[PDB]
Design a protein around this ligand. Structure first.
Ligand SMILES: CN(C)CCCOc1ccc(-c2cc(NCCCn3cccn3)nc(S(C)(=O)=O)n2)cc1
Length: 105
């Protein structure tokens, strides 16, 4: 499974996404005042602060579980927003960055 060395890598990946200029819509759980009907559209929300809590609590047993949470952030964004939205493009850019960082493992 995941070792403590693995978790050091997970935290570094998470921090690199949190510092990215296009991560700002994903840093915290969506405030419904920022996204009308968001929680009527998105049935399984996820955000980077929730992922940080899960990393710190050693919630993940496998790398696939960490990657699934991250992918949910991007999939939720592209489902909720039209493809010409700046928010949708944030997900496209940040997922490309994330997938490249994952190759470093
Ligand atoms: C005041 N607040 C606590 C903190 C300051 C503002 O923080 C945010 C965070 C996320 C959004 C936002 C929006 C949106 N779709 C657009 C909905 C309509 N809209 C257009 C512009 C603003 N709202 N999709 C998404 S996402 C998570 O699917 O990419 N995230 C917006 C603001």
């Amino acid at each position: 499974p995941l070792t403590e060395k693995d978790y050091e890598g997970l935290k570094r990946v998470l921090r690199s996404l949190q510092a990215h200029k296009m991560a700002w819509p994903f840093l915290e759980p969506v405030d419904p005042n920022d996204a009308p009907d968001y929680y009527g559209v998105i049935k399984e929300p996820m955000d980077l602060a929730t992922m940080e809590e899960r990393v710190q609590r050693r919630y993940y047993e496998k790398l696939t579980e960490f990657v699934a949470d991250m992918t949910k952030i991007f999939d939720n964004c592209r489902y909720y927003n039209p493809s010409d939205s700046p928010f949708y493009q944030c997900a496209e850019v940040l997922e490309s960055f994330f997938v490249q960082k994952l190759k470093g493992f």
